[PDB]
Ligand binder design. Structure first.
Ligand SMILES: *[C@@H]1O[C@H](CO)[C@@H](O[C@@H]2O[C@H](CO)[C@@H](O[C@@H]3O[C@H](CO)[C@@H](O)[C@H](O)[C@@H]3O)[C@H](O)[C@H]2NC(C)=O)[C@H](O)[C@H]1NC(C)=O
Ligand SMILES: *[C@@H]1O[C@H](CO)[C@@H](O[C@@H]2O[C@H](CO)[C@@H](O[C@@H]3O[C@H](CO)[C@@H](O)[C@H](O)[C@@H]3O)[C@H](O)[C@H]2NC(C)=O)[C@H](O)[C@H]1NC(C)=O
Ligand SMILES: *[C@@H]1O[C@H](CO)[C@@H](O[C@@H]2O[C@H](CO)[C@@H](O[C@@H]3O[C@H](CO)[C@@H](O)[C@H](O)[C@@H]3O)[C@H](O)[C@H]2NC(C)=O)[C@H](O)[C@H]1NC(C)=O
Ligand SMILES: *[C@@H]1O[C@H](CO)[C@@H](O[C@@H]2O[C@H](CO)[C@@H](O[C@@H]3O[C@H](CO)[C@@H](O)[C@H](O)[C@@H]3O)[C@H](O)[C@H]2NC(C)=O)[C@H](O)[C@H]1NC(C)=O
Ligand SMILES: *[C@@H]1O[C@H](CO)[C@@H](O[C@@H]2O[C@H](CO)[C@@H](O[C@@H]3O[C@H](CO)[C@@H](O)[C@H](O)[C@@H]3O)[C@H](O)[C@H]2NC(C)=O)[C@H](O)[C@H]1NC(C)=O
Ligand SMILES: *[C@@H]1O[C@H](CO)[C@@H](O[C@@H]2O[C@H](CO)[C@@H](O)[C@H](O)[C@H]2NC(C)=O)[C@H](O)[C@H]1NC(C)=O
Ligand SMILES: *[C@@H]1O[C@H](CO)[C@@H](O)[C@H](O)[C@H]1NC(C)=O
Ligand SMILES: *[C@@H]1O[C@H](CO)[C@@H](O)[C@H](O)[C@H]1NC(C)=O
Ligand SMILES: *[C@@H]1O[C@H](CO)[C@@H](O)[C@H](O)[C@H]1NC(C)=O
Ligand SMILES: *[C@@H]1O[C@H](CO)[C@@H](O)[C@H](O)[C@H]1NC(C)=O
Ligand SMILES: *[C@@H]1O[C@H](CO)[C@@H](O)[C@H](O)[C@H]1NC(C)=O
Ligand SMILES: *[C@@H]1O[C@H](CO)[C@@H](O)[C@H](O)[C@H]1NC(C)=O
Ligand SMILES: *[C@@H]1O[C@H](CO)[C@@H](O)[C@H](O)[C@H]1NC(C)=O
Ligand SMILES: *[C@@H]1O[C@H](CO)[C@@H](O)[C@H](O)[C@H]1NC(C)=O
Ligand SMILES: *[C@@H]1O[C@H](CO)[C@@H](O)[C@H](O)[C@H]1NC(C)=O
Ligand SMILES: *[C@@H]1O[C@H](CO)[C@@H](O)[C@H](O)[C@H]1NC(C)=O
Lengths: 752, 743
């Protein structure tokens, strides 16, 4: 049992996870076999060459964010005897300079978010193995440093350097004498307003250039933003990129461009990704000479180029878009326009690989949906945040300018062609809503204030939908025919539906569910279901997972006539059931016994349970996960293993357990993970301490208990050393609440 | 000292407030002389022959919600000869308490289990004017029909108001007293009205038949449509002898057709509710509209046809016959476009002052049509789809939109236009072209990201009250909104800035440009940076709401740049600094708050420190609200720092000691603190009038002999009112928790 770090296996190389643990110095109890050491988010103030003594197998050290919330003091040569050290992360440590005597074995060095104003030869010129060097966020909106001092030729001796990041520094000009090994050069937010033919001298290998945020268009930035005088644009000589023949990635986001010189791309015919977000390029999107110079571009982002105060009728797309033969993804959010016509998108219909069209946040009122049938490989049509109506006729390493998360959930898009119409004005489903759509497999209509009474005919023009997201609407699905035109439906998400037509004796009528042969996942969370009117147990032979949290099972199960005792019983294939957040005080024995026999995972967290009948687990021989967190439980059984042989994970955090019964830390030999964190335990008793057969417990959580650190914590501490297979994570947070002189200390730190 | 009830008076006349007080039985220590006693929301289990004894003068008793049923003995109330008004709501009564005093003018038994309405319970109560029996046999498993025994009401003779709403009745009871003015029959499952149900009720001014055959749209109670698509069935001559009717409620009766004959003999009809029916067809023809020349209020909301989104609203020409109409409610018709053509019939109407078109999903409107009206004051267009123009309580009125459509504070300034919750995501150059002279304008919650530059409002340049709430506006430009010279109220609450520029945002200079701006609300704007070179000068600003911003950041500024940010607001009388995460205010910063202040709120910060001596700088301060902070320190010499302070609110802090000698003060709130005791030294006679209210409930008082010194001071100063005496509660010692401190 290592302490204070959690040691873990990773192929060959053993990692010490030692972060966010309130340490004040480098621990001297780090395993000598450890190869990586994450000491980030602590209170370390001093590093010497003693700090890492006899840790010769160290390959990576992360010291980020120390001291967390005057700088980290690193003595000259502190790291110098670590011969195998490759990666050194020293981010956000308030360093006033580059540490001297860094080891030449380094291939990766991060010094972001410090106060380094001076990049010197003395600091880094001997790091001749360096491949990646991160120096971002150092001389940044800082009254003391007007401009980063880059010693002339400092990087020229770094002949293996492949990645250099200087973003978020007051640079003013590109540093000369960069090594020609450079592949990736990040100069975002550096206050460079002019780029000449000589800035990229000898950089014949460059594959990425990032010049975003120089002369920004300030639109909701998470960092300080300041436009160039006159909101002017970055000035890039015609010939600045003429030698950059390997460039694959070019980021020109937020440079206030109004004009794109076609000649910039002349010698760059393999460019793959071009970011032009947050500029003023509507004119260029219409004439676009540069579009003819990009035969291999795959991703083009032109988002948020709208003209202020403008709402043109139509988007104006140059016919030159038809020259983007390799295009796969087009991002055009925030152009801002009233209607998309068949004709306006003609240039794109020729593109054989175009699979993503992103038109979110354009306030589009009307689209001729049939235009989408005329593409070869359209797979994602993203139209969230527009104004379609019913048709009745921060992390400092972020990519900040690009929409980087999947546009549509991958669980939904994996089914096939995907259409996202969330956050529009589709307040009911018009009879023509889906007319002339391609064969949609994945559909999002979330958050449209949609009050449709579903009747079995609304989705019939797109009958192959497999994943249907209808969350945050006002739908009525009381009709047994609701959604039954969707016979291949697999996943239905009705989370947060509030019913606007409640009829006493009808709502909620859930009969439609029985219709689907292939329905696997159903989310009825936060539907405030407190009444049910189905004659018999609804039966499904397919349903795998039912989410029923945020409803009123407390009312359904307090029914005087016990009508709802059996409501889940006909879910014959169900393995996962979520009954969280249903205000449950006690579940009636007969209601619990009628849960689906097939259950493998049952969540009853965040209720108000004060009683749990453990003996009812005998009825569930497949039960592997039982989640009782966030309740009000006081007692546990002293014979869990008489009630289950399958249970693997038992989660009991945030309850009021003060006592562990004799014979609880077993016998349940199937139990691998037991979570007792955040309860009222003052001690861990002898007898709950037994050892039979093999306590194959491999995770025991205990942090957050008011422990008593007298010699009554001695048993448990001895146990902890007998059973080393049992991991106790976060040992550092298993804290004494008493007596006063032990308070705040780890239960580990007290002597025999 | 009055206990356990708080006993205020109104005439000479005395009222006993004894509600929500955890009482087990009726107290005996009630001021023997009280006229009105309120005992609602308690645990009172029994009312007896003996429960109210010394009270010859009691005119009114309230026993609602006891407990949370109430056992009442025969003749229990007879000893009290003056009783006019008796309230027994939600008491779980199985029967009308027999032998009730004939002195009764008002009786309410709503929300009980009274399935049988007996001549024995009520027939001899011959002086009653108002009787409430609603919510008795309502979706009840044990009662299938309310039984109203024949002629039970016939004798009641002075009865003016009868309510039987929310009861399974199925038929109107026969034999009703002809002195009735108001008859409530909402939600009674009466599917049919005959010629005979109402004949000879010639003094009727109000009839309520709503919720019979409902259209079930978001009801806050159970709702069961008639089977079929079936409307209520009202006989052609049902209202023939109802000549006095002013108020008719037919909401939610699934009407598809209005029989004009129903109105043939109702020359006085004033208010007609037709919400939640199926009246689109009738709205387009409406013969019945010709029969209504005195109607003031017509509600036709939520009559939409399922699944249809017609291009235009189809209003009958017959609407021109509504000569007296003051308000038209047409929510939830659902239509795409409003042209001038479609509202012709209304432009006839000389007194139409309110047009309510909320929730119609309207895409566009010819706004100029609103000029062709004589007396239009309120154009309510909230929850539509207008775009940027370029190139519960059982006494509720459940069906009608009852609150003012627009804040009265806004509407008071003149013609009011409400375009909140539309899609005006920026302000188009044509947004307000051809509008009338708007004085009150609501643009709340439009995701509006307009950069205000001083020209956006030039077509309605006399706006006095502007609601710009819950949007994303940029007002950094010094010209922002300066085309609105007459602006008096600006509400910018919850504005989230989307174009932050370091060194510019927030720039509040535009504020100086107005000579009659009075009220400015910048709450929850997340202001943590300010770029005005000098103190901003307003001579007109009287109230500034600055809550939910970051004064903590502004005031911990290393260069002390924001020390004087409010100083130049020289007329400020009210300042709200709540929810600014304040742990301390620099002495310099506090000294620079306007000397004009009469009212200062710094509640719900995290103040661990307050410099009392600085109140010297505020000779006009009347109210200081320090609630919800973390203060422990009270000065012994408040008198030395202020002779203006009237109200001092200190609840929800951490104070445990009152200093000895602790003039102007009338109201001191020390409730929810950590006071274990007030000591001998903290107390000093004599009365004069001094302070007239002290709050102390929610303190963990030590109930030993120490508290006796206080228990005597209390008796020695009777003009010092202490409320919620029942909640001034012992924590020490073990048996004393948690008795009151009257013991
Ligand atoms: C301007 O555009 C460039 C090119 O798209 C952006 O470069 C990308 O930057 C991100 C984040 O710094 C890099 O992401 C990282 O990928 C590595 C895997 O190599 C992963 O371990 C990290 O967790 C992270 O996801 C990304 O690799 C880089 N793209 C390439 C091809 O190097 C840049 O972020 C944009 N600039 C700004 C300021 O947004
Ligand atoms: C259908 O459309 C809705 C609405 O556009 C999608 O909801 C959005 O989904 C993602 C969840 O993956 C949410 O993004 C998350 O944002 C937080 C930061 O606020 C961040 O912590 C997460 O990493 C993630 O980026 C997004 O907030 C949410 N939008 C709303 C309004 O809730 C939904 O996922 C779409 N459905 C399908 C099947 O794709
Ligand atoms: C309604 O319930 C469904 C089903 O429980 C929720 O969708 C499921 O959400 C979880 C994310 O909590 C998904 O599991 C996650 O998947 C990712 C990616 O493969 C993995 O990295 C995570 O660690 C985790 O396993 C699960 O895939 C997804 N199921 C499906 C079919 O999409 C859904 O989000 C709920 N909706 C709302 C609005 O809450
Ligand atoms: C301008 O438009 C906005 C949006 O319609 C108005 O906000 C609305 O104002 C009223 C307060 O007067 C809120 O109604 C209240 O609802 C609560 C909770 O249900 C209820 O307890 C109160 O009795 C009251 O009826 C309403 O919630 C609020 N709407 C939203 C979305 O916040 C605003 O008042 C209008 N401004 C002017 C100057 O008229
Ligand atoms: C932004 O702040 C303004 C000014 O404080 C808020 O309006 C003010 O709000 C209070 C209601 O909390 C109004 O007081 C009420 O006056 C009526 C008079 O009929 C009185 O009966 C009530 O007891 C109460 O005192 C006050 O009139 C009103 N001020 C103005 C100029 O209208 C406004 O509500 C804030 N906006 C938001 C979204 O919080
Ligand atoms: C039907 O409409 C009438 C108004 O015509 C409502 O009667 C009012 O009810 C409220 C609340 O109970 C009282 O404060 C008013 O004084 C009543 N008006 C009159 C003129 O007496 C009645 O509430 C409506 N019915 C329902 C169920 O909403
Ligand atoms: C389209 O994609 C296919 C599959 O990756 C690729 O083989 C082909 O070259 C692409 N067409 C282009 C780039 O025009
Ligand atoms: C379909 O796309 C092709 C390009 O391959 C184009 O020639 C044609 O005009 C398009 N047809 C329609 C109806 O838009
Ligand atoms: C269910 O929907 C279908 C089609 O709208 C209709 O025929 C049927 O009457 C509906 N059933 C109910 C109970 O409303
Ligand atoms: C499912 O729904 C369709 C359409 O309502 C119907 O034809 C079919 O018989 C239903 N099947 C089952 C098993 O409910
Ligand atoms: C039942 O559940 C399993 C997943 O546990 C799934 O493979 C299977 O398809 C489901 N059975 C049916 C009949 O849908
Ligand atoms: C729990 O369930 C068992 C087994 O069915 C039953 O015998 C026992 O009485 C239950 N205990 C309680 C307290 O309900
Ligand atoms: C309109 O109202 C005014 C004042 O309230 C009154 O003089 C006039 O008679 C009303 N007109 C009607 C009821 O037709
Ligand atoms: C204005 O209203 C009058 C009725 O007062 C009507 O006759 C006329 O046609 C309306 N004019 C316009 C332009 O709508
Ligand atoms: C303020 O707005 C005016 C009018 O639109 C414009 O001339 C000026 O550029 C703006 N000033 C600033 C500092 O943004
Ligand atoms: C209170 O403020 C006055 C004026 O700034 C100052 O003299 C006094 O020292 C202050 N007291 C404390 C405790 O800060």
């Amino acid at each position: 049992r290592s302490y204070p770090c959690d040691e873990k296996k990773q192929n060959d190389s053993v990692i010490a996870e030692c972060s966010n643990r309130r340490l004040q110095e480098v621990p001297q109890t780090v395993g000598k076999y450890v190869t990586e050491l994450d000491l980030s988010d602590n209170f370390i103030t001093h590093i010497t060459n003693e700090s890492f003594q006899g840790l010769q197998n160290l390959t990576k050290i992360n010291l980020n964010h120390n001291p967390n919330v005057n700088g980290l003091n690193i003595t000259d040569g502190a790291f110098l005897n670590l011969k195998n050290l490759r990666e050194l992360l020293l981010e956000d440590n308030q360093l006033p300079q580059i540490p001297s005597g860094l080891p030449e074995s380094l291939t990766e060095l991060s010094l972001i978010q410090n106060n380094i104003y001076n990049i010197t030869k003395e600091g880094i010129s001997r790091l001749i193995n360096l491949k990646n060097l991160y120096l971002a966020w150092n001389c940044y909106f800082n009254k003391v440093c007007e401009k980063t001092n880059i010693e002339d030729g400092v990087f020229e001796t770094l002949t293996n350097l492949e990645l250099l990041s200087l973003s978020f520094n007051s640079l003013s000009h590109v540093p000369p004498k960069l090594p020609s090994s450079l592949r990736k050069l990040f100069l975002s937010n550096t206050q460079i307003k002019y780029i000449s033919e000589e800035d990229f001298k000898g950089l014949i290998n460059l594959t990425l250039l990032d010049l975003s945020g120089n002369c920004p268009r300030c639109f909701n930035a998470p960092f300080p933003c300041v436009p160039c005088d006159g909101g002017a644009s970055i000035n890039i000589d015609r010939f600045a990129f003429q030698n950059l023949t390997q460039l694959r990635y070019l980021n020109l986001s937020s440079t206030s461009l109004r004009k794109i010189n076609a000649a910039w791309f002349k010698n760059m015919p393999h460019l793959k990704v071009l970011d032009l977000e947050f500029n003023y390029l509507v004119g260029e999107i219409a004439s676009g000479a540069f579009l003819t110079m990009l035969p291999r571009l795959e991703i083009l982002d032109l988002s948020f180029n709208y003209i202020k105060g403008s709402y043109p009728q139509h988007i104006n797309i140059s016919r030159n878009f038809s020259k983007l033969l390799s295009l796969r993804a087009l991002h055009l959010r925030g152009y801002v326009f009233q209607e998309l016509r068949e004709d306006d998108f003609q240039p794109l219909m020729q593109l054989p690989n175009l699979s993503t069209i992103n038109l979110g946040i354009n306030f589009i009122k009307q689209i001729d949906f049939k235009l989408f049938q005329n593409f070869s490989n359209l797979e994602i049509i993203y139209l969230s945040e527009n104004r379609i109506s019913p048709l009745v006729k921060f992390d400092p390493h972020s990519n900040f300018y690009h929409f980087t998360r999947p546009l549509i959930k991958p669980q939904c898009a994996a089914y096939g062609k995907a259409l996202d119409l969330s956050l529009n004005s589709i307040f009911f489903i018009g009879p023509n809503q889906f007319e002339n759509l391609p064969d949609i497999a994945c559909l999002n209509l979330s958050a449209n204030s949609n009050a449709q009474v579903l009747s079995g005919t609304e989705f019939s023009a797109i009958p192959h939908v497999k994943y249907l997201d209808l969350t945050n609407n006002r739908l009525d699905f009381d009709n047994a025919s609701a959604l039954t035109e969707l016979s291949d439906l697999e996943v239905l998400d009705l989370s947060y539906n509030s019913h606007y037509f409640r009829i006493a004796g009808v709502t909620h009528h859930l009969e439609f569910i029985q219709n689907f042969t292939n329905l696997k996942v159903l989310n009825l969370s936060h539907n405030n279901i407190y009444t049910l009117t189905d004659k018999y147990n609804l039966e499904s032979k397919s349903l795998v997972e039912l989410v029923f949290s945020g409803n009123r099972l407390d009312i359904l199960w307090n029914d005087d006539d016990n009508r709802y005792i059996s409501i889940f019983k006909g879910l014959k294939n169900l393995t996962r059931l979520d009954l969280s957040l249903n205000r449950l005080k006690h579940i009636p024995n007969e209601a619990f016994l009628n849960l689906p026999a097939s259950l493998t995972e049952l969540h009853i967290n965040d209720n108000m349970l004060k009683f749990f009948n453990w003996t009812l687990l005998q009825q569930f021989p497949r039960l592997e996960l039982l989640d009782l967190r966030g309740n009000k439980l006081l007692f546990l059984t002293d014979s869990l293993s008489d009630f289950t042989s399958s249970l693997r994970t038992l989660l009991l955090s945030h309850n009021r357990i003060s006592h562990l019964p004799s014979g609880f830390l077993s016998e349940v030999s199937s139990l691998k993970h037991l979570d007792l964190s955040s309860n009222l335990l003052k001690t861990i008793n002898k007898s709950a301490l037994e050892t039979k057969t093999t306590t194959k417990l491999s995770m025991l959580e205990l942090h957050g208990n008011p422990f008593e650190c007298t010699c009554d914590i001695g048993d448990f501490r001895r146990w902890m050393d007998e059973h080393l297979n049992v991991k106790i994570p976060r040992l550092v947070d298993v804290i004494c609440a008493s007596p006063g002189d032990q308070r705040g200390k780890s239960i580990v730190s007290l002597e025999l």
